[PDB]
Amino acid sequence: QGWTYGIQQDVKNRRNPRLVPYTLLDDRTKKSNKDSLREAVRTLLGYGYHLEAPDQDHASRAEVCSGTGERFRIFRAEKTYAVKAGRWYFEFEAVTAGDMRVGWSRPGDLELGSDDRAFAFDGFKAQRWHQGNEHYGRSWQAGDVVGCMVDMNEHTMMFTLNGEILLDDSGSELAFKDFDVGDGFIPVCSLGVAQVGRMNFGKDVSTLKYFTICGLQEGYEPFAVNTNRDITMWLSKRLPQFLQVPSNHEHIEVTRIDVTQKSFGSQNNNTDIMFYRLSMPIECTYYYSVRIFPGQEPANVWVGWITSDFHQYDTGFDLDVTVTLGDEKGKVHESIKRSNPGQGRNNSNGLEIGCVVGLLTFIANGKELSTYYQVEPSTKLFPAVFAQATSPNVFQFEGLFKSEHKNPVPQCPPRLHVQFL
Amino acid sequence: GVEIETISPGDGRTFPKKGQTCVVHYTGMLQNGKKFDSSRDRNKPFKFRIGKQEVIKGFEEGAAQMSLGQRAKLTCTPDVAYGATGHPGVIPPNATLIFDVELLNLE
Amino acid sequence: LPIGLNICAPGDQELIALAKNRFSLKDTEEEVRDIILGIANVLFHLEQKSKY
Amino acid sequence: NQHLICDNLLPGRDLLLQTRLVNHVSSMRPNIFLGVSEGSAQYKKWYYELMVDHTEPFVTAEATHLRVGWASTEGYSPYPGGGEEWGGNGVGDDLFSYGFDGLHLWSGCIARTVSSPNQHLLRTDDVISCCLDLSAPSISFRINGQPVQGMFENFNIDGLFFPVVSFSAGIKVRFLLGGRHGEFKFLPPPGYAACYEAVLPKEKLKVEHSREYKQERTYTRDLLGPTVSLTQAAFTPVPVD
């Protein structure tokens, strides 16, 4: 209807707080009616009503509970601040509890103890974490120092909870033991969402809460006892970017061979999505391909020429800038630059062609599908297309297109230059 | 040409004349926003007179098309700037230009 | 308190000076553990020293 | 031969290499969430104002920063550093965006002229108003009550966005929302609303600094963990039906 809510005019005034439901309101806006309702339903108990609640163990139907793993910010310190010898110790308070585990990492999304590059133990469950699960010590809550520590020479990893050295099922001080030093071990803190921590490496022995008990007399050192500076921290981040060459994925390979060709592809069921960004922008109608195996849509692909900015690797598909000039009137003008497909194949059906002169036509397999835009002030690009498949031979990768990236002219044959990775 | 644009003008009247050291604190730029010059960081205001042919004519025409106290966004072209030769080692061939000019005084 | 520290440390120290090692202690602790293995006097000595 | 070759390596200049140090800025917002899901809408026309005093480089470079044009957080996040758009870690950074700073909209370093007489920056004592337009994007601002035409189409409002303000150093301004705290010198025009209507209980609304990871901590280093938003489940309020 729009009772006092007509957004354009609001012909009748006196909007009220009640328009948003009683989730916002409370018994102060319900004492008049709810007492009558409660008297009525009490007399309906007088009728003899029978109704147990649905969300109880008795009437067992509450089956909409499950964990939510997301933004496990693995806080850290600098690799350069690593340690490979001597006794070290550092405290860690806690404002809450939850899926929240700390310890010692190694320089190497996968949480602590899932692989052989970190040692840690939880408080939600009181169990060790190194390449598996193992019970240890005791849980905690708010206002609980953990006080992890190592003796790097003889491998005595311990955790001192307000002076309490925590022990395993066998009742032993040494939680972890017999670890090779290698590239040292650095502090680390994992935190699921709606969990909070606060750390104190060695910044002030006064600010250290419980260090004189079990850290001072044992020859165990703070981290920042000598550093006259802000020791640094960093964390597993949200956006994806380009730094590394894998060559060690689930199963995907890189090479180059003559029109060009490479060698690629997995077998594990790639229900999820992948990433890519070529290292070298090569340069020496303009037909040149980029082939990918799953053709005639084993999974429906979504080809879109796109710039640097992204934020998502999930199934949020079909959710993607225009000049509109005014003349002191409001009527738009000069709207020619605006908004600054779903088919490819390799094996089953085709390939994916590039084109150049400003002028562009990215369409697969030589068939007109009405490309719309030709917008480019300037966009540096290496190829990056990402999609699903049913996992047959899951990926591949193939003047010409190698002409509009650098200063030489369009020329077909690209020559030998020692970097092509 | 010098397609002048203003940013925070002042009087709009005190235009320059011949033999007038335009005391500028400019901050040049390039297309694609790749910076190539400055004066704010040096803390050394530029100084040049009119008609002496010291500077490229873009700055001279921009000053003649400018009043005192007038922050601006000039826009030169290769015709007035270094052209298809280009200033070597800094400017490439056939480069448009941007300048966050700010005139202060005349002596 | 250091007075209480010296109070609890002296008795345990006199205990540990005699209870360091004994073959009779080994056999008697083995018989007791099989009936009910020596008690952890070193653990309690460390627990006292951590406070002291 | 050295001077020959030294003067020969330079003028290639595709070899030559570029850096550009940047002013350090930070965003800000009020405690309001947009939260407008389609189906149980509340107010698709909001209005709030901002009032300023000083924007001077007293000992700084004059390359300052002040914008209010809304950005796509489907395109942007509250981080302190990064991005190939010369950083400038604030509002209007992401290419699917714009930004109102008195004279122009720099759509990810793409200058787009705005239609307004008396073009000038957000100088001392100059008010900045905001409005809302979704179903056909022509999102309006005004400066001291004068026609800011040529508003923006095709910025991605596929769903919602987030309310923002960004500023560099050497700045001193004041929000205006309502009550005592909004002395609206230019009232809501027809079909709008002074945007202090979702003042929810359990807290007086205030600023939030765009879900910062850590402020200037002093006691120790506080790993203020993941608080993704008001709701880990989603970004939406609950009309019960």
Curated annotation (Swiss-Prot), chain B:
InterPro entries: FKBP-type_PPIase, PPIase_dom_sf, PPIase_FKBP_dom
Record field: catalytic activity: [protein]-peptidylproline (omega=180) = [protein]-peptidylproline (omega=0)
The protein's Enzyme Commission number: 5.2.1.8
GO biological process terms on file: 'de novo' protein folding; calcium-mediated signaling; insulin secretion involved in cellular response to glucose stimulus; negative regulation of calcium-mediated signaling; negative regulation of heart rate; negative regulation of insulin secretion involved in cellular response to glucose stimulus; negative regulation of release of sequestered calcium ion into cytosol; neuronal action potential propagation
Family annotation (Pfam families): FKBP_C
Major site of localization recorded for this protein: cytoplasm
Top-level EC class as recorded in UniProt: isomerase
Keyword Isomerase: yes
Gene3D superfamilies: 3.10.50.40
GO MF term set: calcium channel inhibitor activity; calcium channel regulator activity; FK506 binding; peptidyl-prolyl cis-trans isomerase activity; signaling receptor binding; transmembrane transporter binding
Keywords, in A-Z order: Cytoplasm, Isomerase, Rotamase, Sarcoplasmic reticulum
Tissue specificity of this protein: Detected in heart muscle (at protein level). Isoform 1 and isoform 2 are ubiquitous with highest levels in brain and thymus.
Notes on how activity is controlled: Inhibited by both FK506 and rapamycin.
Protein localization: Cytoplasm; Sarcoplasmic reticulum
Domain of life (superkingdom): Eukaryota
UniProt KW Cytoplasm keyword: yes
Annotated Gene Ontology cellular component terms: calcium channel complex; cytoplasm; membrane; sarcoplasmic reticulum membrane; Z disc
PROSITE patterns (UniProt xref): FKBP_PPIASE
Coiled coil start-end: none
Location of the PPIase FKBP-type domain: 19-107
Function noted in UniProt: Has the potential to contribute to the immunosuppressive and toxic effects of FK506 and rapamycin. PPIases accelerate the folding of proteins. It catalyzes the cis-trans isomerization of proline imidic peptide bonds in oligopeptides.
Family, per entry: Belongs to the FKBP-type PPIase family. FKBP1 subfamily.
Oligomer and partners: Identified in a complex composed of RYR2, FKBP1B, PKA catalytic subunit, PRKAR2A, AKAP6, and the protein phosphatases PP2A and PP1. Interacts directly with RYR2.
Protein name: Peptidyl-prolyl cis-trans isomerase FKBP1B
Organism: Homo sapiens (Human)
Swiss-Prot record, chain C:
Top-rank taxon: Eukaryota
PTM note: Channel activity is modulated by phosphorylation. Phosphorylation is increased in failing heart, leading to calcium leaks and increased cytoplasmic Ca(2+) levels.
Location in the cell: Sarcoplasmic reticulum membrane
Null mutant phenotype: Embryonically lethal. Embryos die at about 10 dpc, due to defects in heart tube development. Cardiac myotubes display enlarged rough endoplasmic reticulum and cytoplasmic vesicles that contain high levels of Ca(2+).
Tissue: Highly expressed in heart, lung, cerebellum and brain. Detected at lower levels in adrenal gland, stomach, thymus, esophagus and ovary.
Record comment regarding domains: The calcium release channel activity resides in the C-terminal region while the remaining part of the protein resides in the cytoplasm.
Family, as annotated: Belongs to the ryanodine receptor (TC 1.A.3.1) family. RYR2 subfamily.
Protein's job: Cytosolic calcium-activated calcium channel that mediates the release of Ca(2+) from the sarcoplasmic reticulum into the cytosol and thereby plays a key role in triggering cardiac muscle contraction. Aberrant channel activation can lead to cardiac arrhythmia. In cardiac myocytes, calcium release is triggered by increased Ca(2+) cytosolic levels due to activation of the L-type calcium channel CACNA1C. The calcium channel activity is modulated by formation of heterotetramers with RYR3. Required for cellular calcium ion homeostasis. Required for embryonic heart development.
Protein name: Ryanodine receptor 2
Organism from which the protein derives: Mus musculus (Mouse)
Lineage: Eukaryota, Metazoa, Chordata, Craniata, Vertebrata
UniProtKB/Swiss-Prot annotation, chain D:
Domain B30.2/SPRY: 1-182
Disruption phenotype: Embryonically lethal. Embryos die at about 10 dpc, due to defects in heart tube development. Cardiac myotubes display enlarged rough endoplasmic reticulum and cytoplasmic vesicles that contain high levels of Ca(2+).
Highest taxon listed in the record's lineage: Eukaryota
Tissue expression per record: Highly expressed in heart, lung, cerebellum and brain. Detected at lower levels in adrenal gland, stomach, thymus, esophagus and ovary.
Subcellular location field: Sarcoplasmic reticulum membrane
Function text: Cytosolic calcium-activated calcium channel that mediates the release of Ca(2+) from the sarcoplasmic reticulum into the cytosol and thereby plays a key role in triggering cardiac muscle contraction. Aberrant channel activation can lead to cardiac arrhythmia. In cardiac myocytes, calcium release is triggered by increased Ca(2+) cytosolic levels due to activation of the L-type calcium channel CACNA1C. The calcium channel activity is modulated by formation of heterotetramers with RYR3. Required for cellular calcium ion homeostasis. Required for embryonic heart development.
Quaternary structure (record): Homotetramer. Can also form heterotetramers with RYR1 and RYR3. Interacts with CALM and S100A1; these interactions regulate channel activity. Identified in a complex composed of RYR2, FKBP1B, PKA catalytic subunit, PRKAR2A, AKAP6, and the protein phosphatases PP2A and PP1. Interacts directly with FKBP1B, PKA, PP1 and PP2A. Interacts with FKBP1A and FKBP1B; these interactions may stabilize the channel in its closed state and prevent Ca(2+) leaks. Interacts with SELENON. Identified in a complex, composed of FSD2, CMYA5 and RYR2.
Family, per entry: Belongs to the ryanodine receptor (TC 1.A.3.1) family. RYR2 subfamily.
Protein name (database record): Ryanodine receptor 2
UniProt organism field: Mus musculus
Gene name linked to the record: Ryr2
